[PDB]
Design a protein around this ligand. Structure first.
Ligand code: UFI
Ligand code: UFI
Ligand code: NI
Ligand code: ZN
Length: 341
């Protein structure tokens, strides 16, 4: 049962629809980015063409072992023709390799699928400025006004300052950052840079980062944990028990852990500004939850949609309940009446 919001009308295209078997009529499967809820179903035994960014294609080949004959990477900001239809991939400001897709239908309809994105004013000067867009398939993850969080710049500044202070006060403190999906790499890269260290991680995480075309990555990451003052761990280990366990394995090199858990929005945001964020502490371990989002805030999403002025909006997130659907449609109507389209 492939949902309608993953189908592109007038085409043989689906978007992020790999867990529904052979979709009837689908001649090309697009993947917006390498996140689990979006590539779900893709495996080494997929035998249909997959269209994606170069970075996403690297991850499909090396992490999911999809055969190269079915991986069709496309450059960004470049008009391409897929099965007789003009398409453009645009940077989504989400995770590495994440794209939005512009479809130019033969009948003149223009469709923008945002994939997952964090709307930014720089998108208002992309190839979208040249385009009337009739249908918008919109990442509505945080489509409610209570969803406020700081800029990525502000969050990284807090993380850098917090880590530099803690390690300058105690040179025997270890910094740990939690990760699961790709994305939010700036958190641990910026901290390692201010500490003059490479980032140590597992072989599997190292493999993943090697696929991301990050400039000078070999100067920034390592599998030699002993040489690193900043360690990556699975997000599930970012707790007092998991961190105590990791500290023991470091052989008495460290006597303190400062850990960061990059989250999306938490209602702590509704009460606390980034400068007033405090950690959870138990003994010699402190855990900071930092609101580093790679999705649009409500205000960022509203600004983007009011600039784009689409004729029709199709939400791709929070579609499962009538309450969420009615809430989002109320906001779309508000935005349209305020802006005048
Ligand atoms: C369990 O934590 C996640 C699982 C899946 C995803 C995800 C994302 C952000 C942040 C967290 C997650 C995301 O952007 N996407 O697409 C995902 O699939
Ligand atoms: C199972 O838990 C998730 C599955 C998918 C997603 C997700 C996210 C946050 C937090 C959790 C999840 C998210 O932001 N996005 O985009 C997702 O697709
Ligand atoms: Ni995502
Ligand atoms: Zn997602």
């Amino acid at each position: 049962t492939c949902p309608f919001y993953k189908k592109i009308p007038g085409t043989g295209f689906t978007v992020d629809a790999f867990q529904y078997g052979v979709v009837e009529g689908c001649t090309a499967y697009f993947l917006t980015h390498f996140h689990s809820d979006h590539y779900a179903g893709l495996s080494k035994h997929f035998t249909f063409p997959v269209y994606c960014s170069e970075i996403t294609g690297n991850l499909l080949k090396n992490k999911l072992h999809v055969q190269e004959q079915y991986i069709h990477p496309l450059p960004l900001d470049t008009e391409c023709i897929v099965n007789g239809v003009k398409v453009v991939l645009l940077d989504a400001n989400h995770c590495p390799g994440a794209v939005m897709i512009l479809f130019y239908l033969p009948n003149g309809t223009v469709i923008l699928h945002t994939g997952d994105f964090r709307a930014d004013p720089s998108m208002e000067r992309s190839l979208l400025a040249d385009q009337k867009v009739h249908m918008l398939y919109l990442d509505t993850t945080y489509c409610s006004p209570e969803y406020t969080f700081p800029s990525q710049q502000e969050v990284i500044r807090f993380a850098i300052n917090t880590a530099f202070e803690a390690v300058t006060l105690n040179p025997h403190a270890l910094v740990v950052c939690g990760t699961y999906s790709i994305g939010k790499e700036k958190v641990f890269l910026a901290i390692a840079d201010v500490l003059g260290s490479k980032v140590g991680m597992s072989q599997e995480k190292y493999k993943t980062l090697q696929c991301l075309n990050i400039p000078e990555i070999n100067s920034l990451i390592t599998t030699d944990m002993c040489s690193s003052l900043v360690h990556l761990l699975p997000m599930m280990q970012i707790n007092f028990k998991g961190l105590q366990s990791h500290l023991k394995k470091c052989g008495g090199k460290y006597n303190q852990i400062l850990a960061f858990r990059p989250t999306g929005w938490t209602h702590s945001n509704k009460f606390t500004r980034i400068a007033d964020v405090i950690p959870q502490t138990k003994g010699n371990i402190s855990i900071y939850g930092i609101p580093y989002s790679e999705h649009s805030s409500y205000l960022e999403m509203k600004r983007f949609v009011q600039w784009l002025k689409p004729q029709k909006i199709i939400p791709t997130v929070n579609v499962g309940t009538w309450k969420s659907r009615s809430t989002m449609e109320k906001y779309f109507r508000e935005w349209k009446l305020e802006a005048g389209y």
